[PDB]
Amino acid sequence: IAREDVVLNRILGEGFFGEVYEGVYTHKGEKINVAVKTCKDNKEKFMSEAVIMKNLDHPHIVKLIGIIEPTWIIMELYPYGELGHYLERNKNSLKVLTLVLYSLQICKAMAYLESINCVHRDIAVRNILVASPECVKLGDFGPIKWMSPESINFRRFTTASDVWMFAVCMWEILSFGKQPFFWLENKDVIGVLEKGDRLPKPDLCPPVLYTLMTRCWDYDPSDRPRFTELVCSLSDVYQMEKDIA
Ligand SMILES: CN(c1ncccc1CNc1nc(Nc2ccc3c(c2)CC(=O)N3)ncc1C(F)(F)F)S(C)(=O)=O
């Protein structure tokens, strides 16, 4: 990938390491809309996540097109934008079926990541991209109100703590993008969790799906479902909602 093959058109916004731009990438003459991540120990880490994304090849994880070793990461651009904002715009037209579909698609992403003990740390609707109305994609690697107790208290992140956060993300999806614990300030989140209080069931969320969510919010990380079991469960929730629809 040569920099002459990538034209920058506009700022997309501000990423962890530097600016993100949108532009177009052109070897067969096809014009491809891309997001270009840039970088102002953090350079090497910037590169590490890029190499990881280059090796990931999954339908529900954002696609890396190439890397320009001013180091640019050329990612596929999804113009629909973040899932959170997509949900709030279309909350009156979106059906429960589709919201379970989105959760299942991210869970398939996570299940793949789990199989290589790869902890993601930012499974949140703001970090999920809408590729099409029936396809969401998990964004780049990494939020007190999304984190498990053992991450808030001990800065420990495992696949089990990703499962907790995944259930927080499902809560966000079934809530059409509300922020978890928006009635709480950060300081009293862990206190609330220590007591055994959780997020309440969203109005549109089927009870079977909320039971699954509560299992992911087990204070004990060992008791939480694995992502492989969740995919089967949600596949099961999805087929049922589809039959009702
Ligand atoms: C805007 N930013 C993001 N916010 C949330 C998730 C992802 C990004 C940027 N990443 C991507 N962003 C997009 N598309 C996209 C997004 C957000 C909007 C738009 C398009 C239009 C818009 O108005 N907001 N497509 C692919 C990627 C990716 F991941 F593959 F590199 S930022 C804070 O500047 O980093």
Look up the CATH number of the domain holding residue 226.
1.10.510.10
From 200, 173, 179, 178, select the one nearest 106 (Cα to Cα).
173
> Was 112 annotated as part of a binding site?
no
Would you call 168 helix, strand, or coil by DSSP?
helix
Whether ligand 1 lies within 6 angstroms of the CB of 193 is answered as: no
Cα of 110 vs centre of ligand 1, distance in Å, is: 20
| 13 bridge partner residues | 20
Look up the CATH number of the domain holding residue 37.
3.30.200.20
**Residue 216 sits in which domain range?**
78-242
93 plus 57 within the same structural domain? no
> Was 177 annotated as part of a binding site?
no
The two three-digit tokens of residue 28, written as one number:
């067969």
Whether ligand 1 lies within 6 angstroms of the CB of 196 is answered as: no
Q: Give burial (CB, 10 Å; 0-12/13-18/19+) of 125.
A: buried
Instruction: Give the DSSP H or E segment for 47.
Output: helix 42-55
Report whether 40 contacts 20 (CB < 8 A). no
DSSP for 92-151, please give it: TT--HHHHHHHHHHHHHHHHHHHTTT------SGGGEEEEETTEEEE-----GGGS-HHH
> Was 157 annotated as part of a binding site?
no
Experimental approach: X-ray
108 plus 201 within the same structural domain? yes
Which atom, in ligand 1's list, is nearest to the CA of 64?
30
Cα–Cα distance measured from residue 146 to residue 124, given in angstroms and rounded to the nearest whole number = 8
122 plus 56 within the same structural domain? no
Whether ligand 1 lies within 6 angstroms of the CB of 72 is answered as: no
Burial 161-184 (b: 16+ CB within 10 A, else e): bbbbbbbbbbbbbbbbbbebbeee
